[PDB]
Paper text:
In the redox-sensitive enzyme transaldolase from Neisseria gonorrhoeae, the side chains of neighboring residues Lys 8 and Cys 38 at the protein surface form an NOS cross-link under oxidizing conditions that leads to a loss of enzymatic activity through ‘structural crosstalk’ with the active site.
In our initial discovery of the allosteric NOS redox switch in the enzyme transaldolase from N. gonorrhoeae, we had speculated that a neighboring glutamate (Glu 93) might be catalytically essential for formation of the NOS bridge, akin to the suggested role of a glutamate in isopeptide bond formation in some proteins. Structural analysis of the Glu93Gln variant by X-ray crystallography clearly indicates formation of the NOS bridge, arguing against a compulsory catalytic mode involving a neighboring amino acid. The NOS cross-link is the only modification observable under non-reducing conditions, akin to our findings for the wild-type enzyme, strongly suggesting that this switch controls the enzymatic activity. While amino acid or enzyme catalysts are not compulsory for NOS bridge formation in vitro, they could impact the kinetics of the reaction.
Residue numbers in the entry:
A (entry chain A), B (entry chain B): 2 to 351
Write the structure that this text describes.
Amino acid sequence: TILSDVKALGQQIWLDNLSRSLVQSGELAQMLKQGVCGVTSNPAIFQKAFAGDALYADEVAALKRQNLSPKQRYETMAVADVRAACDVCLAQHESTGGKTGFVSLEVSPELAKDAQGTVEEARRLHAAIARKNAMIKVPATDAGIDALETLVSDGISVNLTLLFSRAQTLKAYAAYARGIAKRLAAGQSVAHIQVVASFFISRVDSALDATLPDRLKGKTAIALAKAAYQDWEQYFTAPEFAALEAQGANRVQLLWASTGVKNPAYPDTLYVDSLIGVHTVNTVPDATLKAFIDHGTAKATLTESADEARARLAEIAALGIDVETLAARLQEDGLKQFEEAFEKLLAPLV
Amino acid sequence: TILSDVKALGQQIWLDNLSRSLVQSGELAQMLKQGVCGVTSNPAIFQKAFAGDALYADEVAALKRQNLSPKQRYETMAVADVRAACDVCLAQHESTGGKTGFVSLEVSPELAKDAQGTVEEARRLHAAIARKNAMIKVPATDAGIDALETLVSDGISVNLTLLFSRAQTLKAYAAYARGIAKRLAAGQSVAHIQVVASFFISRVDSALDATLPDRLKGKTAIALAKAAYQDWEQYFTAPEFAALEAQGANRVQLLWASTGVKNPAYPDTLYVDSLIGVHTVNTVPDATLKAFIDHGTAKATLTESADEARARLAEIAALGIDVETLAARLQEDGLKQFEEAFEKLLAPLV
Ligand code: NA
């Protein structure tokens, strides 16, 4: 029931995992009935699935007999899994006018600084999946925000990932709005275009907690998220976006990612309990989902005590910690980590 | 393009007329391609259509051979017209995710002080029309506001008419919110429930201008509308509504009606030019639509000089003119005019 209580506060909970058995077994479908509202993947999720899930072995053996690149073998397998998960989520998606029930597939991390290559791959994967409720996942580098505007103008739903920066998030909103405005100028639909901005949580605390004083440990990532949500409210309520929304456009939604707790000193539901607010998403790994169902709390926390969050961020700046510099480092490290997972994903498909 | 320019400022323009020939000739469909976004009717509009449009005679003759009351004969014909206009407007409605392309049919004016009778008739007409983009039009008397809550809780979109009063409009918002809260408590959908608040313009100036000083002639109706829009922003951004919006509820939206200019000294586009703002509708008679397309101005005027609207209303009150008393009188006169029109419509259907 708690997932329903969180929907009543305006937040969707998505599952931050995907595998062939999760879908085929009916587990994912049961999750949609319990209140899960979507699925996210990334190269690490697929690396783990392909290595651990017995249902891939027959396809791998068959694909190794064809003149296909390792990447092509991976894509064949992953596109099938995403199409199958989309089909499980389609009734939910259609029941809300296309607002929920999405599955995300990320483009190759090799493309992260290549806008045109990102666009081409995203268009190809979008056409290969051929489902209305698939999102293409793109890292929010500067090239990614370039590609976002193009993809939105092409009518493709996007999950912008590896956001750690309030400034880079806001730049993504502007690129979104440019794409929507283009579509309205060309007489094209916008009501079915959905974008989420995946803003990473635990990695900020993992980076800073050792250096912070006791009173600030475990607070920065949440405070940064609360400030990002304030930025979101300001941007999307202002007159230019209000006019687009009145015509049928949807706002980008913040999506809290990296919400599994890594520090055992903190409650395992800390990063779900603390970030609940209106027109947001939280994507959770399976163990965190279980923990939240078991002993999480559904309260409107994201907009609570926002002044105290801003005070903490000022205190962090005064300690000489520049969260925008930190964000650039975390994004570059996350891209390296996804590229390493993608290479590890491809090696057994040779 | 002007209608398109107004859309870009967040306002839809509807046609304040309906007739069988308007639909069957293809005129309505061609208006939609110009940028018209919906249709409103009322008993006076229907009385004029039935008296003037040659396309009704054959259905009148056939229905006179059936065992039906005059009112049932009228309803059969009006429901057919509304269904046909809803079908013309449906692609537009769907294109925006359900935010545009509405057609309104008003209940009998004899029911205006009878909440339960209004509910029963609105339910019956809603079921007979059987279109997702139909609105049932109900006068905003106290009984109509009672009925509004019930109809909203029944999932029925409502155009609440004959509003001349800021206080009565706020009462309507509160009734809407109670109905939405009922839906959400029952697990029912809210995203499809659309309500507009038809706030009359020209009749206020027609009532007051002869006795106002030169400096206030032709200013009251616009000032009321601007202040009403400020009230709307306050009500729908307050925490109580925000908690319903979080779960998919639409705001009510203001709809400017009686926007044809009746005084020849004023510009014929005065009440369209002056009232353009985000997340509103303006329903215009055909001659005013033509004038607006030809020589209107698309500028965000509704939220311009809001403090001057506040000053003008204070000056009007201090002349001893009570605009709330005026509104009640205008509502009662408007009901009487509609009753006379409806009685005249039914007499030839015996
Ligand atoms: Na205001």
